[PDB]
Amino acid sequence: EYIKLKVIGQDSSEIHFKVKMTTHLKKLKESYCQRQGVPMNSLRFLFEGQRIADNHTPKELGMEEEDVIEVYQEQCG
């Protein structure tokens, strides 16, 4: 089964992903990183306060339909 996930950045920005529940979340992270034009380990992705690792899946993390993934990015200013 597929699940649509909301990925919300610090600036209230929002991107929606539709991802296979058994597929590693590394794909979602590398896709989002490509959209922001930033390197792989440049941001952190949290779900329920837990850091989403490359080999994590929605099934393993009990992710529901329309659940929110939070993005955090270091400010150098």
Binding site: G9, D11, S12, S13, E14, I15, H16, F17, K18
Partner: protein
Amino acid sequence: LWGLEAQKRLRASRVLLVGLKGLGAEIAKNLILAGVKGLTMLDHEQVTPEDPGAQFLIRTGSVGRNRAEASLERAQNLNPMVDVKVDTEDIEKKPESFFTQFDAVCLTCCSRDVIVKVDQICHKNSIKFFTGDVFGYHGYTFANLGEHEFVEEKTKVAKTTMVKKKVVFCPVKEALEVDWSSEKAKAALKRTTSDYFLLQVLLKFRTDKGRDPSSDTYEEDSELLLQIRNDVLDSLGISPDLLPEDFVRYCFSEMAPVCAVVGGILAQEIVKALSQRDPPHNNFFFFDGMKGNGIVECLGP
């Protein structure tokens, strides 16, 4: 017509700030630098021996002088374009006519009863209401803007443009006197931070003792706070085990860093409200400087 109109709306606004201790100092400094049309600092109290330091707008050598009066020079010096004013009279005996000259009113150091009254006055006269206090490592802000309209730009959504939005706030009395016997409130209870109920405890202290808990009388205040903890939580249908005993040792006096944090958030909320540019935090902001939590709760409805 543009975000430039939000700029001129702020620069035409007059704010009333009550209470010129640590938190009020921070709020004044922030709002003045921002460029409000003017700010009126209201305090009835005089500078005490332990005030010139902790309050950076007060000069060393001002003990015995009115706290708001002694703040004026430093406060004005920050921005000559701001109309910085003082009021030495008591807020509790201030007529309703006085408030109508201000776009926003921000209360610090006031008793619950003064908080509710002034809030009720603002709503009657469409004035924007704010309150906030610091207690040790804890600090909070509350807003009541009633029917509030703002223009926030919404970032692109793909799988940026401006949009008008209306948010409805509620009176402080409803926000403070929440009924927890309801079915909706029971499920809300688990999600509600214990800092809300801590606020309830400290308000009762302030109303009864005429002051906040202090480092000088730690042991007596600490005993009364535990007594109030039971008398407030049990009188709400909530098991008094939500606030642990160790809460007493983290809510005394005014931590300068906490004023910095809570004064920074509150001031910005005042700015947002007056400019009508960004979505103001709906209702409460609770900060615990020991845990690094900044929570926005919506209570009252």
